[PDB]
Structure formats: structure tokens, C-alpha cells
Symmetry: D2
Amino acid sequence: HHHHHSSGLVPRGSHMMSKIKFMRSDLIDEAKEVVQHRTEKEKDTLHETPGIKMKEDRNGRVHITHIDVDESGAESIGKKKGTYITLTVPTLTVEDAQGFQELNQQLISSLKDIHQALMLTDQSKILVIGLGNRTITPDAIGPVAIDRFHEAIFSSPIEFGQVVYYAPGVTGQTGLETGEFVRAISERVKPDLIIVIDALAARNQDRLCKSLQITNTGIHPGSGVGNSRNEISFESLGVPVTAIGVPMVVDAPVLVVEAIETVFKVISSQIGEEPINVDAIKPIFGEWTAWSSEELHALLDEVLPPRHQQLFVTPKESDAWVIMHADLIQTGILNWLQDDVFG
Amino acid sequence: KFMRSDLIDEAKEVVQHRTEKEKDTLHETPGIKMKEDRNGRVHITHIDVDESGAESIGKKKGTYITLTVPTLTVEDAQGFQELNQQLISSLKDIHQALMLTDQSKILVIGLGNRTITPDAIGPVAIDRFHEAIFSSPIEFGQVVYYAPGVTGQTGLETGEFVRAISERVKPDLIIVIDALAARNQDRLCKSLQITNTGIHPGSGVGNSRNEISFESLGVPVTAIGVPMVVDAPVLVVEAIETVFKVISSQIGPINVDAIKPIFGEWTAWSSEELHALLDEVLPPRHQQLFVTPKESDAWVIMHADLIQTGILNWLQDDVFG
Amino acid sequence: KFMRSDLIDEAKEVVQHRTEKEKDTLHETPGIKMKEDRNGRVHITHIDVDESGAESIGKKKGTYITLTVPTLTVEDAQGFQELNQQLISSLKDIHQALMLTDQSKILVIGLGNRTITPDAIGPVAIDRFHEAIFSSPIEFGQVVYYAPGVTGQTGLETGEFVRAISERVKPDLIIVIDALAARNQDRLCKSLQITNTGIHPGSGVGNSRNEISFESLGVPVTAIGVPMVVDAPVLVVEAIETVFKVISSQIGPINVDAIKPIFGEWTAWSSEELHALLDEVLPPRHQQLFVTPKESDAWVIMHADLIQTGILNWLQDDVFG
Amino acid sequence: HHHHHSSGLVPRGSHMMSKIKFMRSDLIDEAKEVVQHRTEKEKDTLHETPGIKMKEDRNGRVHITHIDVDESGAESIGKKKGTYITLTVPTLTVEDAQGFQELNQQLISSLKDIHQALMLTDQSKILVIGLGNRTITPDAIGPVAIDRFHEAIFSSPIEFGQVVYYAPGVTGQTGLETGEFVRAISERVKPDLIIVIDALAARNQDRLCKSLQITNTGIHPGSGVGNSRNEISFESLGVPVTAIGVPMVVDAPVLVVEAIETVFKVISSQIGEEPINVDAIKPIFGEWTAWSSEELHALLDEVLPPRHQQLFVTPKESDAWVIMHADLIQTGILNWLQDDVFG
């Protein structure tokens, strides 16, 4: 009859708002179309999203996902055209020096892969920006990366000059958005590459602090912890823009949504001693077992006190995580600059 | 331990005692006395726990003043000031049983990890406290203070640490500032909890504070706490309950029969049953997640200023000066 | 450039004009007008430089109010408050020629490197400024502010940087907070210098500030400076001169003939001659050393609070509100 | 006639006060007796300070000075009995990654040399303390070292536990001296070694940030930037105490004193186209050309405004220095712990 199970209860407008929020979630490998395109490879099957080429390697403990989104796939799934490399150590912990060491290697290799077509010379001027608010622990990735980057420049062949770096902080206090601020600098610096380091938001809490995502599509709008970034890309600016991000937070309503769906999934997987067996669990757990993640999120948006959307979720030791990742990202960028741009 | 809160006004017994009471009855049950009060925009909650209360509810015996401005925001200048006067007032009352003079020694302690935003209440308060004292011509040499941070890295528990200082400074009062975990998100950063019960075991963001009490080191220990986080599974349970209550009321006290076919049988369950199922099926890592306002760095500043100002106004007006 | 100071009341011409004047004469020389005044414990020094003054002394043409509490310490509550009212007052006067309304845009800029203690005046002031604004219910959306730190790391000079913001925010006033180098150590942290000449080239701890002026970006630029350091060779010269003056006076205006056999012929030299010999013989690294009070972190806090409070009291009383 | 040239002008008391201040200067290689004992080796000459054995090596750009002070020499020169290793790269700059790399090697080697006689096992509990006030740039050595030490523990075999570490900060705000505070912890931790990292004061400004001094005599009283340390040593505490210090400041009156003496020395060395030729320069420069550094300092103490003694002198980029040295000291300690105590 109706097309969506929530119709009659969740406003159609709120459902559409949530569909959009989820298409613009920071991890491309969390788009629904990308998770279907991975399952679909059972010796290759149709692929209803055609504008998605997905490579999948693995090198030690690092699982690599290379995704190219062409112009057709971008209109389909709502994410800028370009390349997305996601590196993931699922077992990673703060103490896991080896995993961090392996991620460092994979990061340097992916940095030249994604930048080979730029044809970078030992005469290129490279601008590194760490976005984030330093006093919000999981958002401090960017700024702490810039601090460590500046430190490592001393002990390194790389002269200052030909690599310039800034951590803009909360640029809104001065009357500019992070977009204009990075533009105001890139105009005078005239860089050949702009690398932006930022903290990202995941939907599944098990993703947090265990992945890097490198993309040549820049900083997408509505991204980051504050859900408030402006586009910073080769299109907005005229300079190639690479974003390196690590997922540090879940939005409070999104964490609720995945918990509810985890109840449904776990109960479903234990039938017969990750799909939801709606027919079996619906008499117990209700019609919303049939709903999609966005319908549940639209429900939460309507029903929860509004302060819920001002809340984030992060690990209790996310300050150790920030330190480990800020050191990983700065090191891979600098070793990449040494090996394959300046030496 | 389900639905863990550090606020005393959030334990089930105290929420029922509060509705037996305002339903102009008297019939309590635990053996705990609780007077309410409002002073302008501040809702004061005086709560007293005898030893009968203590073992019933699982909270130490003593006194619990809870101030709250429900519409408080960071820009709320007026809200923050009445909060401060009420804090000084509560501070003399809870300590008038103590008869402190200009010759008694007050040790102020800020607990918390500075690099975890909502946990910074403690150390940022000591910072601002320090600033105020040396901004004041008053020596305040009868006021010492410290923020020990993560004492674990030195191989000492926060209890031992505070005792090693208190053993040597030999104080007559110990005021501890610290951030609390709460159970309802809308309580976050809008209440202070003053109590002569000190710091209860397993309180805080990390759910792991050691007891710092009268009973733990032999000095009076008064805690000033701000609820700054909710634990992630606790938040999920409250949110699911809020879906139920909101949808039920919008239909026409939860109406389980009307919402059960959409939202399922657990619409009838208790908070503890919901929390037990989530504890069984969610990945363990949820236990390691906390939930906090995106503006929590601003909240830390505002509350660190409030608490330092209260302690110092109270010290110079009613214990020195 | 010998005996470099950033305070205008420390240039030789202004020290002679000040003794021609108080010796109840009039006969100046440069073409600069200088009224003195004291308001309680604050010594105010209004100084005006026309273009004749500008090229004589090597300081930009404009107005220079210099407030000073010679007995100021960090604990000096009263000293710090009169300082603040006098700062607001000086801020309306220096800006009453500007006719700013509730619709004009004020950009406040804190210069300095946060990790160099005495250079932190600027950024710590912006921090505290930010706190005060969002503590105030007033939006202050006509007040924007930034602390750019060490803009050099991004490949931009501080001048360009401030212009890239000012170009886009298009302000009507720019107030810059910054730490100054002085020439007499006993001036350190006891004066504010307000001036519509902005930030002179080569001022600051690093002796390397770019000009930020009316003439550099076309907006009014008012500097609020605190003298926080002395350059090391400058300090040596002043100290040697102090030996001479103290020993000479203790004998019975320096008495060169009496002290020359103990302290040598350079007892008769000028400050510039002494500084030239030191510049020739000392290792170059002296040029890279600064001198600052051991308590300078406390001073940064106190003055950052003062300056933020002045700017904001003045903005809401005399430009908004 | 009289024994001291300043007699009649400088009070005898102030001269004695300054003699003491200079015997208790942080760098043992700046004691007057130690500089004479080095010159004296012209194929060995008498040595009027007999309680001083001085080794002198050099390994790459690192100049090493090993000094042992026996009980006789300690009464003579006023510095605790024990060993002092001073490593120095005179050419060192913040950017000098190689010099820092060489200093790191020398530091690890000296750390086991000075600790061999302790017979440390993989079961020893080691306590590292970084003293200093973090908001006074050159004094931030200690605390920043502890931050970096804590970070490197994650990425390193060394479990936390068996190496505990604290940065006490300004312990006077709580009613304890840094002495009692380190005692209050060492009693409960019961360490087998206590390593203290602190910033030191030099007399010659050319020393700043170019040396490390490792000693088993602990933290001497009156040391550090504040001239206010309490003894923290094997004697005060009962646990062996090693101090690692780097000189970051000159006291303002002491900098004046060396400037004045530099005038006298430079003028003196250019006669005939580091002694002071008193007879030649005294008609020009005065009787105080004959005075000793302490007599000049005693003069300054009497004559200068008292705020002069509340002033310190540090390089304009001493924050980069703190970062480079805090990373050097933490790295050498941790590599020493790995190679020669736990692996």
C-alpha cells in the first residue's frame, strides 16, 4: 500500500531530512549503497549503484578499501565525485604500537597513490590545515596534529617554507567560516596541495578511532563533530584539497538508532541457534522492526528533547586516541612529503 | 548496578518519596527526610539520609543539597548569579555543624582529567581558584588547594593521593570539586550537588572514583559535583523510554496497549529490564562511551568560575574576614 | 637602534620634554604636547605627536595615553580596579573622535605566541574576552575577535593576516592587544599604553612586529600594550648605569670624577655609547635573549583580565547598551 | 694589604652571600675549581682541588665531561659527593636533528654508566618526576617531559607499572614543598630509582639549551629557575635519585656580571692583536677589573633595585628548546629502560 512503514507516524518531511543526514555521514563506507555494493560481489552481482568501483586489499592487519565515485554514482548517493581510501585496523587499541606502525605504512602509500596524478615536484608549496576545537577532546585531532607537525619540522630535512601549516580553531569567533578562512590563506599562500585534517563522526560506535579515511574530495559540508563544516574542496577553492579524517564521535540520536537496530539484529541472528528477521521478531518487538535507520532517526528527531542533538558520544580515553592519531597523521604526511615530493 | 546516576535526586526511592510528599501526604518508606524549596530561579532540594536510608538506597548517610536552574544556559548571567549566592548559603548551612574559625585549615581538591572536556570541572576550578586568591590581597594561607589529575600514572589511587596530602597539611575540612555522571541528559550542567558524604566509590565519568569521605581519611569531606555526562547505555534506555512516553501521551502514565503493536512488548518493561537487555546484546565498547554536550567546554568554564567563587565568598565571609 | 623601548614615555626627547615641563617652564623642542595627570593611584600621561614630532623622535604621529600604577603587584586588587576604570575612560577619549554607534563593527586582536610566557598577553586576553562575551547575555555580534598566534608558520605575516580578516569582516575599529618591550625593568607589568598609532614595526618581544596601523590597512587601529620584557643588552646597560648613579649619589647628577677610578672612564659615557660597546663585544646570542619577571605567568592572567574587562565595559557602556 | 679588592665598598657579608650563591650554581662545570682543574691538566699539574677526578671524552659532536666528587672535594667546593656527567653540543640549534640524535645516544650510554652499580633488574619499580612550573616557558622542561613520557609508554613494550611518573607542578599551592611531595609518593610507590627532570640555571648565556647534566646526587637545594628547590636525593629519601637537567635561564644579576666580565675579557684578549689583563685595562676600566665574579655580584646585590633578582633571562625561542629537550630526555630514559633494565 504505502511505500514506507513509518508513514502515518513519522512526518514525511522528517523522514526526508533524516535520509539526507545519512547520505551526508562522514564515512563513505557507511553509506547504505556502499555496504550493498560490497555484499553484491558474490563473484560479481549486477551492482545497482553503477558509479562505484570498489577495490579491497589487506596488508598485515590493515584492511584497505579503495572507492572511486564517478559523476553518475555521485548523483545517486550524494557524495562528491573523487576517490576515497579508508584504512582500518579493527583490533586497534591505544597500546597497539604495531597496528599503529602498520597504519603508518599504509597511510604513506595511500598518500602517494591518491596524489600521483597531481605530479608534485620539489618546488610545490603545500598547505596543511588542522580543523577542530581544541577544548572538545575528540575534536582536537586537527589542532594537535598541527602542533606535532610543527615540532617534527625542526627534526626533519623539510625546511619550513614549501610546507606551511595552520590550525584555524573556531573561526566563527572572528566573523568568518572555516571555508572563507582557509580561502583567505590559500589565496596568499597559493598552494599546490591543501591537506585538511579533521575529526569525523561515525554511525556505528565500533568504528571509532580504528579507521583513517583519505579523500581528494575535500571537507564535505555538514561534516565534523559540530555537523557544521563548509565545503573546502578543489571546487570551492581551485587548489586540490585532500581530507584526512578519523571518526571520533557518534551523534547522540544516531547512537540510539544503532542500539535499537542492534537489539533487532542480535535477536535475529540467534534464530535457529546482518539482516533483521522482521517476520519473526515483529510480534515481540513491534512494527518499527520493519523501519529503516532513517525512519527510526526521524522518529527520534520528532520525539526526543532537542538537547539530544547537541550531544556527542566518544570513548572515555579519546584523549589518548587523539594523541595516537594526531601523531600517526602528521608522521605519514611528513614521510610522504620526504620520500615522494622532496627527496 | 543499572541506570547508574551520581545525583541523589535520581535514585528511584527519592523519586517516589518526592511524589508521595508533593501529593500532600507524608507516607514515605525509606526513613529519609527531604524538604524542597525555591529561591527565585533556583530549586533547592535538602535531603537527609540516616543509616536506615543508607542501606535501603545504596547511598552514604549524610546531607545532600541539590541546586538547579532548569532553564540555565551559558549566557544566563542572572541564572548563574542566583546559583552562586544559593551555593554560598548552602555552603554555610552544610558546614555550620562544623564550627570553623579563622584558624581552621581548608584544603580544596579538584578531581578530574584535564584533557577529557567534561571531566575538567575539577582542575579548571582549581586554576580559577588559584587566580582568585592571588588576585585577592587576602593571603588565604589557611586555604590550600590541588588538582591531582590522573593520579593512577604515578601508581597511586586518588584516595591515597588526597590522603598523602591531607596527612601532611592536616586539614579540618576538605572540599572536593568533581564532575558527575547523571541519568537524564536534561540534567547536565544545570545542577550542583553539595554533600558532606564526600566522593562515593565508582562515581565520575570513568565510573571508578575511590571513596574520599569522612570515613576514608578522618577529615570532613564535602563534595561539590556538576553532572556533566551520561553513560551511553543509560542514555539509550532513557531515550527509548522517552519515545514510549511521548508517543503514548500523544495518543491520549504510559499506554502500553496502544503503543505495543508499533513499539513492542518492552514498552511495558522497567528501566532495569531495558538496561539488562541492552547490556546483554550491545557490544561491550558501549560501556566505554560517555555522552556530553557539544558546548561542554563553555560549561566547564562557567561552572568552574561559579564553584570557585562560591567557595571563596563563603570562606572570606563566614569562616575568615 | 640602541636602547630599544616600545613605551613612548621612554624615548629621550619625551624624558627631556617632561623635565622642561615640570620645571614649570614650557620651552620644549620637538613639537609634541604632553599633559600629565594622576587619578588616585594611577598616573595618566596624555601625549600627542604631530608630524613634526613624528620625524624628530622616530615614532608615529598620533595620541599616547600611558596609565601607570608604580606600586602595582599581582595581589593589588585596588590598584588593578582603578587601573580598569582609567582604562575605560582613556578608551572613550581616544575613540570619541571616532563616532561609533551600536551599528559599528569592532574587531579585537590578540597578538603573541601563547607558549612564550610574557608574549601570552594577547592570546590569553582573547580567551578571557571570549569567556566574558558568552558569559554576558548580550550577543555582542558587532564584536569579533581573534588571536592569530605565530602567523609565520602559515607563510603569512601578522600584518597580512590581520588584513585578510579585516578585509572580510570590514571593521570600523581594530583594537590590538600585545606585549611590549621596555627599557627600564621596573616598568614591567605596571603600565598600559593605549594609542591610535596601532602596532609599530619592530615592536614586541621578538622585535619584529609588522606595522598594523590606520596607514597599513585603512581602518582605525588602537593598540593596548603591556611592557613585559626587556632585551638583554638593554638590561645590562641600565644596570651598569644604575651601579654608577647609586654609588655616585652615595658619595655625596653622576659624579664621574669620584667614581671613575673604581668604575672606569665609561662612567661618563652616554647610554648609547655603553650599548654600542656591548653590541661589539658580547656574543651575538645576547640579541636573542629576553628578560622577564619570574612571576610573569601571574601577570599575564591579571593584565589579560584587566584589558578584556576594559574593552568590554567600554563597548557596552559607550558604544552599545 | 686587604685580601679582597672590593673590601671597603662591597659589604663583607654580601660578598660571602655571593660566594655561596656561586658555589651552588647548577652546572658543576661552572664551579671555579672545576674550570681550574681542567686548565691544570698540562700533562697533569698539581691539582689544588684533589677531590675531583675529571674524565673528558668526545664522540661525534658531543663533548662529554665525567666528574667524580669524593667526600674531600665536596667539602672543598660545596657540591654533594657523587658523579656528574655533562654532555654538550656547542654548535647545537633547535633544527640540529643530528646533534639531537647524537646527544640521544650519549644520553642513553651515560644513563647506564651512572646506574650500572645500581644492579637494576626487570623487577625494579622506577619513579620519574618532572619538576617545573608549566606556565613559565623555560621551566616547562619537566612537565612536558612527563607528558611525552606518558605518550611514549603507549607505543612501547614498557607496560605502565614498573615505571610510574608524575609532574608535581607548583606543590607550594597545596602546603607542601617539592621535597615532601616527592617523599609522600616515593614512600607508597617504594621505588628503586627516582629520576628527576628539571630546568637549570647557567651563569654564561652561551651554555643555555646546549648541555645535559646527569648526576646521582639528586636535586640540590636552591637550584632551578626559582632558586628554591629542596634537596631530593638518596640522602633525603633513602632511594637512589638521579637528576637530569638542562640549563634554560640565567639570573638577571648574573647575566649582568658576565657581560661586564666579557667586556674585560674581550678587551684583554685583543692586547697585542681567558684571563683579564688587569694592569693594562685598569686605568681605562677601573678597579673592579681586579674583582672576582662574586664581588661584582655582591655589588649588584647591594646596588640594583630588588626586582632584578625576580627576573630571568631565556632565549626568545626557548619554547622550541623545551620541546626538543623534553623529547630528548624522555627518549633517552625510555630507550635506556628498554635496552638495559627490562630487555
